[PDB]
Every structure is written in C-alpha cells, then in structure tokens.
Design a protein around this ligand. Structure first.
Ligand SMILES: O=C(Nc1nncn1-c1ccccc1)[C@@H]1COc2ccc(Cl)cc21
Ligand SMILES: O=C(Nc1nncn1-c1ccccc1)[C@@H]1COc2ccc(Cl)cc21
Lengths: 304, 304
C-alpha cells in the first residue's frame, strides 16, 4: 500500500528528446520516426515574441537554419513545415529509439507525465493534470519549451502535450502534438489571463477511494446525497459539476470499496463544508485532484 | 517557474530491471554488469517469512533454482551469494544497458527517485525521502520488492535503496545495494514498529526558499531568531534539530533570495505556532519536507 503522485517511466520519451536551435534560440524537440516536433516560436527572437507573424518569419528560414542535435550528433534537416503552433522538421534519419506512439488531445481533468527537458536533455519527470481552465501547473524554466506530456499503455506512448509558454500568473500553456493549444492561448508575449481554476471533482472522489483502499477512512460519514444536491455544494466551492458519466467511471472503485459513489459525494460535501480540521488524507491537508479514477485503479493494481 | 515533486528521468534504471523467480516467489532484480541484485526473501515461501533462517534456506538453492528474466529472455545464472539481506546472482551476460553507477548509503532527510516495478517491469516513478525514522513513504504493492531508489549525477546513477517490505503501519523499509537495511528493520514477518517520524527541517527551509523564488512570499515575516531559539520550537513540533551544517547547506538559497537563513527560520517558527490559516504554499496546505536544498537548486536551475 501507500499512495504517491506517480509519473509513468520516462525512458521511452527520453529516447526521443532532441535539441532544436534556430538562430540564437534553443529549445527541445520530440524526434519520432524521421520528424522532429518543436514549438514554432523557436524561429523568434525575444523582440519578435511581442507580435510575431509566424508565416512571415518562417519565409526567412531554410532547412539548414534549423539545427537538430540528438545526443552529440547532428541530424540533417531535409524539410520543414508549420502545423498550427508546431514545426515539423523532417530529418534524413528515422529515430532508432522511436517507441509505438499516438498523438492524442486530452480533455480537462486528464492527467499525464511531463519529462522536463533543457537543451534536449532530460531534467526530471512529474505528474500533471490538464486543468479545467486548460492550463497546467508545471515546473518549467526558460528553455523547457518543447518538453512533452504523455501517457503509456503497456508499450505505446500517447503524446498529449507540448510545452510552449508560461503566463504572467506563473501557470503553463501548450499544445497537443498537432500544434493546437489547449485553451484560448496564443504563442505570443501578450496579456493572457487564465479563467477559473476549478477543482476536478471526479478526480477528488477517485483520490478519496484511493485513501479508503489505503486505510485513511476518518472522513467517511453516515450520510448520503444526490447528484443535484452535491452539485449545488460543489458549484459553491468552485468544484466541477459531477455527471452520471463520472459516477459510471468511478464504478470499479465503488465496487472495490463497497462505498456507493453518492455516499462518497456526501463525505466530500462535509469535507468542503466543515474543512479538514487540521487532519490529513494520504498525508495531504488539501483535497488532491490530480489522480484520475484510471490512475487510482492503475496504482492500486500495479499495471506495468 | 512552478515547483513540482519531481523524480529523476528513469530510463537508465528501466534498462536494469529484471524479474527474479525462486520457486513460487517472483520479485524484481537490478541487473548491473553480470550481477543481478535482489532481496534475499525471494527464497522464502510465505510460511518461511515468520522466522526465516536465510543461510539454511539458501543451502537448498542452486544456480538453476533462480530464474532471471530480462524482457522476454532468460539469463543464465552461473553463481549466487548472499550479502547481508540481498542476493547477488552472477549471470553469464553483462547487461548491455548498464549505466555508469555507484552504490551509496544515504543519510535520513535525503531524497531519491523510486522506479516501482512488478515482474521486472516498470510501473511508475516517484520522489521519496529517507525519513529520520529510516522508513520511506512509498507506493508499493506485493511484488514491488526489488524496486530501487536512486539519484542521478549527469550520467552516473547512484543506487541508494532497494525495497524489501512494508511494516504493519503501511510504511516501507529496505536496504542499500549492499543489503544493509536502513534502520533497525529485519526482513522477517514480525512486529516491527517505526519510531517517531520527525519533519526534515532543513528540507522545509529549502522548500520555503523555493516558494520565495516562485513568488509565494505571504509567509515572510518581519522577525528573526537564533538556532537555539528556533530548535526549542522545532523540538516541540517534532521537527529535526537544525545545525550550522544545515545553515551552510542552505547558503546558496539564502544568497539567491537575499533572505538570511535565521530570518527564514523565524518565518517557519511562526508557521508552526500560528498555522497556515487556510492558506497554501506552492499549492500545499502543509509544510513539505521531501525536497533537499540540492533538489531545490537543481529544479530552479534546470540541471540535466
Ligand atoms: O513563456 C516562455 N517560456 C517559458 N516556458 N516555461 C516557463 N517559461 C518562462 C520562464 C520564466 C519567465 C517567463 C516564462 C517563453 C518566453 O516568453 C514567451 C512568450 C510567448 C511564448 Cl509562446 C513563449 C514564451
Ligand atoms: O511486506 C512485504 N511486501 C510488500 N512490499 N511493499 C508492500 N508490501 C506489502 C503489501 C501488502 C501487504 C503487506 C506488505 C512482504 C510480505 O510480507 C513480508 C515480510 C517480510 C519481508 Cl522482508 C517482506 C514481506
């Protein structure tokens, strides 16, 4: 037992990280087959970022202006194209370490691992969730752009995120691997404010089930509630509305613990109204919302 | 910016994970060069665990009774020996993916990454700290034994921990890579209670410096304190005593932020006495103690 914020093993993604340099700007790229994917803002100078016209800036660039380095070896660029906010650099060598992969666009509330990189080299790995305001709360310094978010299904890596920027508020924004930003964010150095960061209710419930599976049961109460009554309390506390789909998703956790989803909702309702009273749940003094029901089942079963 | 509980990239350690089976027991092994390291309790039946005599149980085992599998290929065992609580299985093939490595024995308060494995396959990676009572608060299910804790210095992996067991209290115990347990624990299914789990004070301070570097400054106060006055408060709150060595270690963080260590100690003193008052620091409602000053500097500088 024990419950930890766990990331997927990162080896498969480490084998794909490369350094992309254009002019004086250096960031990370993801090398899959004979294509290197990187944020398009690699072609900008800090002076361009204020109001960049990427199509115009790109006309000034040729295959030889994009320097791609994997380890200490230089890859030859034989083509370049812009797809939304990402650049695809066709190289002459297929990545020999290319894992089985997919490009997916995740929904808010979904979690993923981030392999934070600098100059194409891995720095660390941590677990994130796509917030309901389409930002992530990462750990990203200057040069981390191009680091990716991913999930693993046995041996297939699903790439879901590519890091592009930090907003003035310190939160992070980026795209899926087709270059489309999550949320209303643009790759421009301009006033961009995030919307309300609500709590991912279904994930809090999944984490409450993980706590009961791990022996932390103090919060379990004698009450029950309805989806409508629960959602009235949830909206008041900036919690996402809970749907019958979320109740269904929690089904296996409800089955394993013998605690009906609506009973767990009433326990959570009392936690919101009464607070934690100086107590902890799985060593946390706040309600954790960055474990999906799938992450909870996965960790408590030992999927490899 | 942003501050996350970050583990080291795990690829280098994934390339070393193997499955070791003896009789009906299957656990994980670490394959470095032509040696596979695993917990010695692999030779026990659940019935033996109550009071095992490892030297006697080992006499009944031969090289061919230890089945080592790396991926889907079987390694040939040409020798076996017991070193403290670990078995070293000499195989006929050196691990081609052996990274540069060291075996280190860490001190309490030190952090490390865990690559949780099942049947020699990686399940996930998370960040731990060796508690001052020599336990770890991991996420380990049956079969996770043999999973290792490690740190990375550029390209050299320092293996510091091998998982062996869970105590009745749900906390975890294990050895360094020479088979010596951290703490007073024995690899036996017997009543083993951990001592006081105190907070790692120097790590809390390092995390308070990480918060100031990341903009969370609400807790900074107008006061200062002395090591003796601070330690009187710290002992009352089950915090580890702070030494001049810890003040020295925090030196670079103090230099970067312009906040003297003793001023940060007075801020922490007030947090202990007055509480958080419903507030958060780096999104946490409790004081985090599982980032060393080195982890803070590393994350805030982007070491790869
Ligand atoms: O945000 C950016 N990079 C970054 N990535 N993670 C954190 N930060 C960062 C670190 C420190 C301070 C500020 C930001 C770059 C710089 O300014 C822009 C403007 C637009 C874009 Cl698309 C990208 C960027
Ligand atoms: O603790 C053990 N394994 C394990 N590793 N992580 C968590 N657990 C675990 C999971 C569920 C329940 C209880 C334990 C084994 C089983 O019992 C013993 C007795 C002695 C030793 Cl040295 C090892 C073990």
């Amino acid at each position: 037992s024990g419950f930890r914020k766990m990331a997927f093993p990162s080896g498969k993604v480490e084998g794909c990280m490369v350094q992309v340099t254009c002019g004086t700007t250096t960031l990370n790229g993801l090398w899959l087959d004979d294509v290197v994917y990187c944020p398009r803002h690699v072609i900008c100078t800090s002076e361009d970022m204020l109001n960049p016209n990427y199509e115009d800036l790109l006309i000034r660039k040729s295959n030889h202006n994009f320097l791609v380095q994997a380890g200490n070896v230089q890859l030859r660029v034989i083509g370049h194209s812009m797809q939304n906010c990402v650049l695809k650099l066709k190289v002459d060598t297929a990545n020999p370490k290319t894992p089985k992969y997919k490009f997916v666009r995740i929904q808010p509330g979904q979690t993923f691992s981030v392999l934070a990189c600098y100059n194409g080299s891995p720095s660390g790995v941590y677990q994130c969730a796509m917030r309901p305001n389409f930002t992530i709360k990462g750990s990203f310094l200057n040069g981390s752009c191009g680091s990716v978010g991913f999930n693993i299904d046995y041996d297939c890596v699903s790439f879901c995120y590519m890091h592009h920027m930090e907003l003035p508020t310190g939160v992070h924004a980026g795209t899926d691997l087709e270059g489309n930003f999550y949320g209303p964010f643009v790759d421009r150095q301009t006033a961009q404010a995030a919307g309300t960061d609500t709590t991912i209710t279904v994930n809090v419930l999944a984490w409450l089930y993980a706590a009961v599976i791990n022996g932390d049961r103090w919060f379990l109460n004698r009450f029950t509630t309805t989806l409508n009554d629960f959602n009235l309390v949830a909206m008041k506390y900036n919690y996402e509305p809970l749907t019958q789909d979320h109740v269904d998703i929690l089904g296996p956790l409800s089955a394993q613990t013998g605690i009906a989803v609506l009973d767990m909702c009433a326990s959570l309702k009392e936690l919101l109204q009464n607070g934690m009273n100086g107590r902890t749940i799985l060593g946390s003094a706040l309600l954790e919302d960055e474990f999906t029901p799938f992450d909870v089942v996965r960790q408590c079963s030992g999927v490899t």
